Amino acid sequence: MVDAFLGTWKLVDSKNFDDYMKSLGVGFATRQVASMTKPTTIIEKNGDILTLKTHSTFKNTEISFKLGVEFDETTADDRKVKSIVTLDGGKLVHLQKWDGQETTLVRELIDGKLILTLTHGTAVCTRTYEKEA
Numbered sequence: 001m002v003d004a005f006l007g008t009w010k011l012v013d014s015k016n017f018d019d020y021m022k023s024l025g026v027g028f029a030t031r032q033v034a035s036m037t038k039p040t041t042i043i044e045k046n047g048d049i050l051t052l053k054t055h056s057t058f059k060n061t062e063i064s065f066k067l068g069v070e071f072d073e074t075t076a077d078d079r080k081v082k083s084i085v086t087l088d089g090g091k092l093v094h095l096q097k098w099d100g101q102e103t104t105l106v107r108e109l110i111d112g113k114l115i116l117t118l119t120h121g122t123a124v125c126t127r128t129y130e131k132e133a
């Protein structure tokens, strides 16, 4: 399936990202900057290997992974986590685990937009991405 996620996406809406970052322990100065950053997400495939790049003026990240295979990940906020990405009900589900905690990053296509839902603790953030030509 994964093919419909592929491409370049830009952030157009964000709800409750501050709650989500607060929940992760992200300091206030970083949250400041993050609240005003509009990342670009690039999803590419080479065979069974996906690469997910997130680019912004603030921080950049890149991960490559095979679906269903665990990998080490250092997140934007400097967490060292164990991650797995799978396709579930047509959604791309990214689970990060560290120190007994979990957060999920779920990507779904709705109406041609990429909706990223981030959950940690009680905090739920929805970020909407639109496809760039």
Ligand SMILES: CCCCCCCCCCCCCCCCCC(=O)O
Residues within 6 Å of the ligand: 011, 021, 024, 026, 030, 034, 037, 039, 041, 054, 055, 056, 058, 059, 060, 061, 075, 076, 077, 116, 127
């Ligand atoms: C690398 C660009 C990520 C967004 C800007 C900085 C955020 C800094 C700390 C919070 C990071 C929490 C985990 C990643 C959130 C991903 C959000 C997204 O892809 O839209």
